[PDB]
Amino acid sequence: XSVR
Amino acid sequence: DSVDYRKKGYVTPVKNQGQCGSCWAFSSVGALEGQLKKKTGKLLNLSPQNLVDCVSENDGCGGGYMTNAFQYVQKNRGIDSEDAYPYVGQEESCMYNPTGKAAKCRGYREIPEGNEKALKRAVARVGPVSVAIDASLTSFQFYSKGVYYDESCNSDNLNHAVLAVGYGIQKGNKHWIIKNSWGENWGNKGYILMARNKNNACGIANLASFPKM
């Protein structure tokens, strides 16, 4: 191889 | 032995994503900006919104991949300037405008997974590189100075995209120079020095890429  | 692209005009001012998980967009535009300077001799702020609202393969404020962004820019035959398509911190409908086009992309390359040597070579030979890391630790978040290393950082939990704008050494600790998207207020004027050649700490070389221009 969750790349934010 | 070291290199810092900020000194070279390859790096724009530190941005702030606000309440939006658009770290990937900031990382992508950052890489694009670096290539723009290198190819044309000048840069400007590119627009992360353009990516948030138009990269359908991604999840907007919910997360995305930098490679999907680079692909969009190529397929779209351009990306807008920030001034042209300003950042509002929430996803909206795609409003790309060709009149505003400020850069182009002819593809991308991914760094070999886990290879810091390859990453260093890419930073030297290309310029700023998009990366992803585990930014979840309390210690990362309250960072202010020095070369960050925390063994509990998880290389398999790449939750935060950032930009490697250089590399170096400080008091004998080798490092990557990292541009974040949490405002100038965070870290060291928006930046953090992250440990280099310490077993791929925080997964720095796990998901690295750059755009072709």
PDB file of C-alpha atoms in Angstrom:
ATOM      1  CA  UNK A   1       3.376  -3.242  -2.140  1.00  0.00           C
ATOM      2  CA  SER A   2       0.000   0.000   0.000  1.00  0.00           C
ATOM      3  CA  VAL A   3       1.984   2.961  -1.331  1.00  0.00           C
ATOM      4  CA  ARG A   4       0.308   6.270  -0.208  1.00  0.00           C
TER       5      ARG A   4
ATOM      6  CA  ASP B   1      31.747   9.293  -3.977  1.00  0.00           C
ATOM      7  CA  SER B   2      28.632  11.368  -3.305  1.00  0.00           C
ATOM      8  CA  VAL B   3      26.048  13.490  -5.119  1.00  0.00           C
ATOM      9  CA  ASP B   4      23.295  15.907  -4.166  1.00  0.00           C
ATOM     10  CA  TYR B   5      20.937  16.989  -6.922  1.00  0.00           C
ATOM     11  CA  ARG B   6      19.437  19.787  -4.842  1.00  0.00           C
ATOM     12  CA  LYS B   7      22.651  21.686  -5.393  1.00  0.00           C
ATOM     13  CA  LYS B   8      22.288  21.185  -9.120  1.00  0.00           C
ATOM     14  CA  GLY B   9      18.825  22.609  -9.670  1.00  0.00           C
ATOM     15  CA  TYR B  10      17.263  19.228 -10.241  1.00  0.00           C
ATOM     16  CA  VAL B  11      14.985  19.480  -7.252  1.00  0.00           C
ATOM     17  CA  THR B  12      11.917  21.531  -6.578  1.00  0.00           C
ATOM     18  CA  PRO B  13      10.768  22.853  -3.188  1.00  0.00           C
ATOM     19  CA  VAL B  14       9.288  20.388  -0.725  1.00  0.00           C
ATOM     20  CA  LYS B  15       5.590  19.807  -1.109  1.00  0.00           C
ATOM     21  CA  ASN B  16       2.871  18.780   1.244  1.00  0.00           C
ATOM     22  CA  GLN B  17       0.352  16.086   0.384  1.00  0.00           C
ATOM     23  CA  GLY B  18      -2.083  17.128   3.109  1.00  0.00           C
ATOM     24  CA  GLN B  19      -4.894  14.677   3.874  1.00  0.00           C
ATOM     25  CA  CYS B  20      -4.404  12.509   0.808  1.00  0.00           C
ATOM     26  CA  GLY B  21      -2.388   9.398   0.259  1.00  0.00           C
ATOM     27  CA  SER B  22      -0.768  10.772  -2.852  1.00  0.00           C
ATOM     28  CA  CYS B  23       2.845  10.162  -1.929  1.00  0.00           C
ATOM     29  CA  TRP B  24       3.273   8.211  -5.145  1.00  0.00           C
ATOM     30  CA  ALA B  25       2.240  11.240  -7.180  1.00  0.00           C
ATOM     31  CA  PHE B  26       4.710  13.492  -5.476  1.00  0.00           C
ATOM     32  CA  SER B  27       7.454  10.910  -5.996  1.00  0.00           C
ATOM     33  CA  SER B  28       6.613  10.517  -9.690  1.00  0.00           C
ATOM     34  CA  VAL B  29       6.512  14.245 -10.361  1.00  0.00           C
ATOM     35  CA  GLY B  30       9.771  14.583  -8.510  1.00  0.00           C
ATOM     36  CA  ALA B  31      11.492  12.100 -10.762  1.00  0.00           C
ATOM     37  CA  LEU B  32       9.943  13.750 -13.806  1.00  0.00           C
ATOM     38  CA  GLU B  33      11.102  17.161 -12.641  1.00  0.00           C
ATOM     39  CA  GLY B  34      14.651  15.901 -12.301  1.00  0.00           C
ATOM     40  CA  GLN B  35      14.635  14.540 -15.813  1.00  0.00           C
ATOM     41  CA  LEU B  36      13.124  17.756 -17.117  1.00  0.00           C
ATOM     42  CA  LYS B  37      16.086  19.714 -15.787  1.00  0.00           C
ATOM     43  CA  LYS B  38      18.545  17.225 -17.089  1.00  0.00           C
ATOM     44  CA  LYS B  39      17.089  17.047 -20.575  1.00  0.00           C
ATOM     45  CA  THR B  40      16.056  20.681 -21.083  1.00  0.00           C
ATOM     46  CA  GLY B  41      18.291  22.540 -18.668  1.00  0.00           C
ATOM     47  CA  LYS B  42      15.379  23.822 -16.635  1.00  0.00           C
ATOM     48  CA  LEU B  43      12.422  22.555 -14.638  1.00  0.00           C
ATOM     49  CA  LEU B  44       9.224  23.593 -13.013  1.00  0.00           C
ATOM     50  CA  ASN B  45       6.708  22.196 -10.590  1.00  0.00           C
ATOM     51  CA  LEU B  46       4.754  19.444 -12.274  1.00  0.00           C
ATOM     52  CA  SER B  47       1.315  18.511 -11.180  1.00  0.00           C
ATOM     53  CA  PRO B  48       0.626  15.671  -8.862  1.00  0.00           C
ATOM     54  CA  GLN B  49      -3.130  16.279  -9.135  1.00  0.00           C
ATOM     55  CA  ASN B  50      -2.954  15.472 -12.842  1.00  0.00           C
ATOM     56  CA  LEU B  51      -1.712  12.054 -11.728  1.00  0.00           C
ATOM     57  CA  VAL B  52      -4.138  11.646  -8.824  1.00  0.00           C
ATOM     58  CA  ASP B  53      -7.146  12.427 -11.036  1.00  0.00           C
ATOM     59  CA  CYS B  54      -5.977  10.774 -14.257  1.00  0.00           C
ATOM     60  CA  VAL B  55      -3.992   7.641 -13.467  1.00  0.00           C
ATOM     61  CA  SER B  56      -6.837   5.236 -13.461  1.00  0.00           C
ATOM     62  CA  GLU B  57      -4.528   2.267 -12.823  1.00  0.00           C
ATOM     63  CA  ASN B  58      -3.893   3.875  -9.423  1.00  0.00           C
ATOM     64  CA  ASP B  59      -6.145   4.648  -6.458  1.00  0.00           C
ATOM     65  CA  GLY B  60      -5.913   8.426  -6.175  1.00  0.00           C
ATOM     66  CA  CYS B  61      -5.665   9.443  -2.532  1.00  0.00           C
ATOM     67  CA  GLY B  62      -5.746   5.775  -1.777  1.00  0.00           C
ATOM     68  CA  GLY B  63      -2.334   4.974  -3.137  1.00  0.00           C
ATOM     69  CA  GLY B  64      -0.574   4.186  -6.362  1.00  0.00           C
ATOM     70  CA  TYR B  65       2.469   3.057  -8.214  1.00  0.00           C
ATOM     71  CA  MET B  66       5.011   5.417  -9.668  1.00  0.00           C
ATOM     72  CA  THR B  67       5.460   3.177 -12.694  1.00  0.00           C
ATOM     73  CA  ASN B  68       1.746   3.505 -13.483  1.00  0.00           C
ATOM     74  CA  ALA B  69       2.265   7.273 -13.365  1.00  0.00           C
ATOM     75  CA  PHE B  70       5.197   7.218 -15.776  1.00  0.00           C
ATOM     76  CA  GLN B  71       3.161   5.014 -18.092  1.00  0.00           C
ATOM     77  CA  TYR B  72       0.266   7.439 -17.991  1.00  0.00           C
ATOM     78  CA  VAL B  73       2.463  10.378 -18.875  1.00  0.00           C
ATOM     79  CA  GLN B  74       3.817   8.529 -21.851  1.00  0.00           C
ATOM     80  CA  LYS B  75       0.469   7.314 -23.094  1.00  0.00           C
ATOM     81  CA  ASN B  76      -1.102  10.737 -22.515  1.00  0.00           C
ATOM     82  CA  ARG B  77       1.722  12.434 -24.370  1.00  0.00           C
ATOM     83  CA  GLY B  78       2.222  14.804 -21.475  1.00  0.00           C
ATOM     84  CA  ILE B  79       1.820  16.061 -17.953  1.00  0.00           C
ATOM     85  CA  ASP B  80       0.595  19.500 -16.829  1.00  0.00           C
ATOM     86  CA  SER B  81       2.445  22.071 -14.830  1.00  0.00           C
ATOM     87  CA  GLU B  82       1.357  22.567 -11.241  1.00  0.00           C
ATOM     88  CA  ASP B  83       0.210  26.048 -12.130  1.00  0.00           C
ATOM     89  CA  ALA B  84      -1.844  24.559 -14.904  1.00  0.00           C
ATOM     90  CA  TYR B  85      -3.446  21.842 -12.802  1.00  0.00           C
ATOM     91  CA  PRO B  86      -3.091  22.764  -9.126  1.00  0.00           C
ATOM     92  CA  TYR B  87      -3.107  20.382  -6.195  1.00  0.00           C
ATOM     93  CA  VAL B  88      -6.183  20.281  -4.077  1.00  0.00           C
ATOM     94  CA  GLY B  89      -5.628  17.272  -1.860  1.00  0.00           C
ATOM     95  CA  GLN B  90      -8.574  15.229  -3.002  1.00  0.00           C
ATOM     96  CA  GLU B  91      -9.292  13.312  -6.118  1.00  0.00           C
ATOM     97  CA  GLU B  92     -11.421  14.962  -8.712  1.00  0.00           C
ATOM     98  CA  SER B  93     -12.324  14.320 -12.322  1.00  0.00           C
ATOM     99  CA  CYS B  94      -9.641  14.255 -14.915  1.00  0.00           C
ATOM    100  CA  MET B  95      -9.057  17.750 -16.174  1.00  0.00           C
ATOM    101  CA  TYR B  96      -5.804  17.391 -18.086  1.00  0.00           C
ATOM    102  CA  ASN B  97      -5.110  20.191 -20.558  1.00  0.00           C
ATOM    103  CA  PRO B  98      -2.636  19.951 -23.374  1.00  0.00           C
ATOM    104  CA  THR B  99      -2.150  23.696 -23.309  1.00  0.00           C
ATOM    105  CA  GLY B 100      -0.545  23.186 -19.933  1.00  0.00           C
ATOM    106  CA  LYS B 101       1.796  20.398 -20.903  1.00  0.00           C
ATOM    107  CA  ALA B 102       5.174  20.926 -19.237  1.00  0.00           C
ATOM    108  CA  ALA B 103       6.882  17.585 -19.658  1.00  0.00           C
ATOM    109  CA  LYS B 104       6.810  14.311 -21.506  1.00  0.00           C
ATOM    110  CA  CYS B 105       7.860  10.757 -20.859  1.00  0.00           C
ATOM    111  CA  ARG B 106       9.066   8.046 -23.265  1.00  0.00           C
ATOM    112  CA  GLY B 107       8.845   5.207 -20.758  1.00  0.00           C
ATOM    113  CA  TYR B 108      10.488   3.984 -17.571  1.00  0.00           C
ATOM    114  CA  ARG B 109      12.948   1.615 -15.922  1.00  0.00           C
ATOM    115  CA  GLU B 110      12.828  -0.278 -12.651  1.00  0.00           C
ATOM    116  CA  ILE B 111      15.811  -0.857 -10.516  1.00  0.00           C
ATOM    117  CA  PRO B 112      16.591  -4.520  -9.858  1.00  0.00           C
ATOM    118  CA  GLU B 113      14.764  -5.485  -6.736  1.00  0.00           C
ATOM    119  CA  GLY B 114      16.815  -5.119  -3.580  1.00  0.00           C
ATOM    120  CA  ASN B 115      19.970  -3.969  -5.281  1.00  0.00           C
ATOM    121  CA  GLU B 116      21.392  -0.864  -3.609  1.00  0.00           C
ATOM    122  CA  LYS B 117      24.415  -0.852  -5.935  1.00  0.00           C
ATOM    123  CA  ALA B 118      22.119  -0.594  -8.905  1.00  0.00           C
ATOM    124  CA  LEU B 119      20.209   2.158  -7.150  1.00  0.00           C
ATOM    125  CA  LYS B 120      23.374   4.143  -6.575  1.00  0.00           C
ATOM    126  CA  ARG B 121      24.289   3.713 -10.207  1.00  0.00           C
ATOM    127  CA  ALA B 122      20.857   4.932 -11.232  1.00  0.00           C
ATOM    128  CA  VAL B 123      21.037   8.011  -9.026  1.00  0.00           C
ATOM    129  CA  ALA B 124      24.497   8.851 -10.438  1.00  0.00           C
ATOM    130  CA  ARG B 125      23.689   8.164 -14.034  1.00  0.00           C
ATOM    131  CA  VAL B 126      20.109   9.305 -14.281  1.00  0.00           C
ATOM    132  CA  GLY B 127      19.367  11.701 -11.461  1.00  0.00           C
ATOM    133  CA  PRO B 128      16.611  11.602  -8.814  1.00  0.00           C
ATOM    134  CA  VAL B 129      14.902   8.228  -8.531  1.00  0.00           C
ATOM    135  CA  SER B 130      11.421   7.328  -7.294  1.00  0.00           C
ATOM    136  CA  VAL B 131      11.479   4.925  -4.383  1.00  0.00           C
ATOM    137  CA  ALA B 132       9.213   3.285  -1.847  1.00  0.00           C
ATOM    138  CA  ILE B 133       9.821   2.600   1.808  1.00  0.00           C
ATOM    139  CA  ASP B 134       8.365   1.590   5.121  1.00  0.00           C
ATOM    140  CA  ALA B 135       7.580   4.930   6.704  1.00  0.00           C
ATOM    141  CA  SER B 136       5.303   3.525   9.425  1.00  0.00           C
ATOM    142  CA  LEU B 137       7.675   3.613  12.380  1.00  0.00           C
ATOM    143  CA  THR B 138       7.354   6.226  15.053  1.00  0.00           C
ATOM    144  CA  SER B 139      11.056   6.859  14.774  1.00  0.00           C
ATOM    145  CA  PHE B 140      10.925   7.628  11.053  1.00  0.00           C
ATOM    146  CA  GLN B 141       8.077  10.046  11.576  1.00  0.00           C
ATOM    147  CA  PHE B 142       9.744  12.085  14.305  1.00  0.00           C
ATOM    148  CA  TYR B 143      13.015  12.196  12.426  1.00  0.00           C
ATOM    149  CA  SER B 144      15.009  15.401  12.539  1.00  0.00           C
ATOM    150  CA  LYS B 145      18.693  14.771  11.979  1.00  0.00           C
ATOM    151  CA  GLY B 146      21.428  12.269  11.363  1.00  0.00           C
ATOM    152  CA  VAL B 147      21.374   9.150   9.269  1.00  0.00           C
ATOM    153  CA  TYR B 148      18.265   7.215   9.985  1.00  0.00           C
ATOM    154  CA  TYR B 149      18.474   3.553  10.829  1.00  0.00           C
ATOM    155  CA  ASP B 150      15.982   1.416  12.732  1.00  0.00           C
ATOM    156  CA  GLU B 151      16.236  -2.339  12.466  1.00  0.00           C
ATOM    157  CA  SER B 152      12.568  -2.882  12.957  1.00  0.00           C
ATOM    158  CA  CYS B 153      11.860  -1.119   9.687  1.00  0.00           C
ATOM    159  CA  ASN B 154      10.107  -3.562   7.418  1.00  0.00           C
ATOM    160  CA  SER B 155      11.449  -3.968   3.879  1.00  0.00           C
ATOM    161  CA  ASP B 156       8.416  -5.907   2.926  1.00  0.00           C
ATOM    162  CA  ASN B 157       5.983  -3.175   3.963  1.00  0.00           C
ATOM    163  CA  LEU B 158       6.408  -0.484   1.376  1.00  0.00           C
ATOM    164  CA  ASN B 159       3.708   1.935   2.489  1.00  0.00           C
ATOM    165  CA  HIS B 160       5.239   5.236   1.539  1.00  0.00           C
ATOM    166  CA  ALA B 161       6.681   6.615  -1.731  1.00  0.00           C
ATOM    167  CA  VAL B 162       9.520   9.168  -1.711  1.00  0.00           C
ATOM    168  CA  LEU B 163      12.378  10.452  -3.863  1.00  0.00           C
ATOM    169  CA  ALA B 164      16.100   9.737  -3.691  1.00  0.00           C
ATOM    170  CA  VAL B 165      17.800  12.982  -4.703  1.00  0.00           C
ATOM    171  CA  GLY B 166      21.293  11.904  -3.862  1.00  0.00           C
ATOM    172  CA  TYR B 167      23.706   9.890  -1.788  1.00  0.00           C
ATOM    173  CA  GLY B 168      26.632  10.427   0.484  1.00  0.00           C
ATOM    174  CA  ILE B 169      28.162   9.897   3.852  1.00  0.00           C
ATOM    175  CA  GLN B 170      27.879  11.675   7.192  1.00  0.00           C
ATOM    176  CA  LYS B 171      30.201  11.007  10.127  1.00  0.00           C
ATOM    177  CA  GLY B 172      31.031   7.685   8.586  1.00  0.00           C
ATOM    178  CA  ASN B 173      27.485   6.577   8.034  1.00  0.00           C
ATOM    179  CA  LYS B 174      26.627   6.076   4.366  1.00  0.00           C
ATOM    180  CA  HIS B 175      23.282   7.427   3.265  1.00  0.00           C
ATOM    181  CA  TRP B 176      20.682   8.225   0.703  1.00  0.00           C
ATOM    182  CA  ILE B 177      19.337  11.770   0.504  1.00  0.00           C
ATOM    183  CA  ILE B 178      15.540  11.514   0.564  1.00  0.00           C
ATOM    184  CA  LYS B 179      12.889  14.090  -0.373  1.00  0.00           C
ATOM    185  CA  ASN B 180       9.578  13.532   1.417  1.00  0.00           C
ATOM    186  CA  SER B 181       6.106  14.973   0.714  1.00  0.00           C
ATOM    187  CA  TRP B 182       5.053  15.967   4.222  1.00  0.00           C
ATOM    188  CA  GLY B 183       5.897  19.664   4.030  1.00  0.00           C
ATOM    189  CA  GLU B 184       9.045  21.576   4.696  1.00  0.00           C
ATOM    190  CA  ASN B 185       8.096  21.298   8.369  1.00  0.00           C
ATOM    191  CA  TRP B 186       8.846  17.562   8.538  1.00  0.00           C
ATOM    192  CA  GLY B 187      12.249  16.053   9.129  1.00  0.00           C
ATOM    193  CA  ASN B 188      15.172  18.207   8.011  1.00  0.00           C
ATOM    194  CA  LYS B 189      13.433  20.852   5.964  1.00  0.00           C
ATOM    195  CA  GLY B 190      11.334  18.119   4.355  1.00  0.00           C
ATOM    196  CA  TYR B 191      14.227  15.760   3.841  1.00  0.00           C
ATOM    197  CA  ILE B 192      15.682  12.741   5.587  1.00  0.00           C
ATOM    198  CA  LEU B 193      19.018  10.987   5.370  1.00  0.00           C
ATOM    199  CA  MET B 194      18.431   7.282   5.179  1.00  0.00           C
ATOM    200  CA  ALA B 195      20.953   4.521   5.810  1.00  0.00           C
ATOM    201  CA  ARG B 196      22.675   3.108   2.715  1.00  0.00           C
ATOM    202  CA  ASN B 197      24.330  -0.289   2.247  1.00  0.00           C
ATOM    203  CA  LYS B 198      22.784  -1.564   5.444  1.00  0.00           C
ATOM    204  CA  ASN B 199      20.905  -4.460   4.050  1.00  0.00           C
ATOM    205  CA  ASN B 200      18.343  -2.502   2.069  1.00  0.00           C
ATOM    206  CA  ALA B 201      17.017  -0.742   5.143  1.00  0.00           C
ATOM    207  CA  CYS B 202      13.353   0.168   5.064  1.00  0.00           C
ATOM    208  CA  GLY B 203      13.218  -1.446   1.628  1.00  0.00           C
ATOM    209  CA  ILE B 204      14.780   1.481  -0.136  1.00  0.00           C
ATOM    210  CA  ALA B 205      15.769  -0.532  -3.183  1.00  0.00           C
ATOM    211  CA  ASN B 206      12.678  -2.684  -3.358  1.00  0.00           C
ATOM    212  CA  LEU B 207      10.526  -0.581  -5.601  1.00  0.00           C
ATOM    213  CA  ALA B 208      12.717   1.905  -7.384  1.00  0.00           C
ATOM    214  CA  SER B 209      12.121   3.460 -10.737  1.00  0.00           C
ATOM    215  CA  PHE B 210      12.838   6.320 -13.049  1.00  0.00           C
ATOM    216  CA  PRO B 211      11.253   7.922 -16.116  1.00  0.00           C
ATOM    217  CA  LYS B 212      12.788   8.112 -19.541  1.00  0.00           C
ATOM    218  CA  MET B 213      12.699  11.414 -21.340  1.00  0.00           C
TER     219      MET B 213
END
